[PDB]
Design a protein around this ligand. Structure first.
Ligand SMILES: N[C@@H](CCC(=O)N[C@@H](CSO)C(=O)NCC(=O)O)C(=O)O
Ligand SMILES: N[C@@H](CCC(=O)N[C@@H](CSO)C(=O)NCC(=O)O)C(=O)O
Lengths: 216, 216
């Protein structure tokens, strides 16, 4: 396979690329990186950040999941994951950037000690409320009737929410508080592409529990 | 004028939009916002962040300078500010995102107290070295022989460097340490479009000095 993807089994960032490639029907070779012993190709291809994912097409590398997603959308334009209208595309990019900026609040809640856990959860709920009210609205998905790059970027929120609930013991996405966003999260998880491509849940929660245990 | 731009006289973010519009030859109405008494249109158009710039086209608003820049490039494709090849476009977006991520180091250096000022300056120099070596290379501009959206995004670095040097008293862009990036910064400042469109330097340094004086 011409296309290569360097990833990590538990990474939402490399899963974003797997979803986009599988949606487009692009064959690819997947390379699992040991983050404690990074491959020579990983360090050569991504000297700036030394992170996965690293997507390679025709021997040329691309780092940063959002940048890779836009390259895939431009290179394989069939089965579009962005709208064609520039204004609608700007709204999609606006919400993808909002997700990237606000993703730090989820890590803060995940590592928050007993005190200030209530405050960290409060800030996450507000982020989700704005996302629901101004981003999603009454649509089934951020992409309308089917998922698009906005829904793919928000898989990271679902990953964080499910882990925070099962490990931290706090639920920041309550059906009675955010009915539309909660319905979205359930619908997203049930999309066959998503159902078929995600880290083993038991293995993922165990891994994340050990990561949280480090920060005391 | 159909196109409207809500900005702030001392903002590099609204200057990014002015540069792109003037390069494209798009007429626009400029609205100066008082950040202490935001207009009804500013709060209506940008409820998520309540910030300038806010670009309006056909009565429809767009917030976030990088998102607005891509909308302008797609809407007025003549005089291109991004390459057409998807791989080259991905490298442009990669370096624009690197600039956004690393811009926080400049604010850190600007507000750094006497102790840890040396450390903040060290981290900025490393950011600039990677930008020079891996981003700019031997090109005159990030856009090659003429400025593109990458150069426009890096006007923010020039704004910070000039202010840090004249206010903090530390020079993080030395010609003998970063010759290519220093030559780039001088060439960028001398582009007639840039020379003709920037905050009054005396007025800007005075304003920024007062902003730094607040954080003690
Ligand atoms: N902005 C990037 C983030 C990638 C990332 O965090 N990758 C992590 C593992 S995923 O939890 C990574 O590769 N870290 C390297 C390390 O742990 O040393 C993107 O969106 O592609
Ligand atoms: N991510 C945005 C940043 C805009 C911004 O910081 N704007 C500031 C003033 S510029 O120094 C702003 O509008 N702040 C509002 C306030 O001070 O309340 C962009 O790139 O458009």
């Amino acid at each position: 396979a011409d296309v290569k993807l360097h990833g990590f089994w538990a990474s939402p960032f490399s899963y974003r690329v797997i979803w986009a490639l599988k949606l487009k029907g692009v064959e690819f070779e997947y390379i699992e990186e040991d983050l404690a012993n990074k491959s020579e190709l990983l360090l050569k291809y991504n000297p700036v950040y030394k992170q996965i994912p690293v997507f390679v097409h025709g021997g040329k590398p691309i780092a940063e999941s959002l940048v890779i997603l836009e390259y895939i959308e431009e290179t394989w334009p069939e089965n579009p994951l962005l709208p064609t209208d520039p204004y609608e595309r700007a709204m999609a990019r606006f919400w993808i950037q909002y997700g990237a900026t606000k993703s730090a609040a989820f890590g803060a809640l995940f590592r928050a000690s007993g005190e200030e856990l209530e405050k960290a959860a409060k800030e996450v709920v507000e982020v989700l409320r704005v996302l629901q009210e101004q981003g999603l609205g009454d649509k089934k998905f951020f992409g309308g009737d089917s998922i698009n790059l906005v829904d793919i970027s928000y898989g990271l929120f679902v990953y964080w929410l499910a882990a925070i609930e099962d490990i931290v013991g706090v639920k920041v996405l309550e059906p009675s508080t955010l009915p539309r966003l909660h319905a979205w999260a359930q619908n997203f998880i049930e999309v066959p592409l998503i159902k078929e491509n995600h880290p083993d849940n038991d293995k993922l929660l165990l891994h994340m529990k050990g990561v949280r245990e480090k920060m005391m």
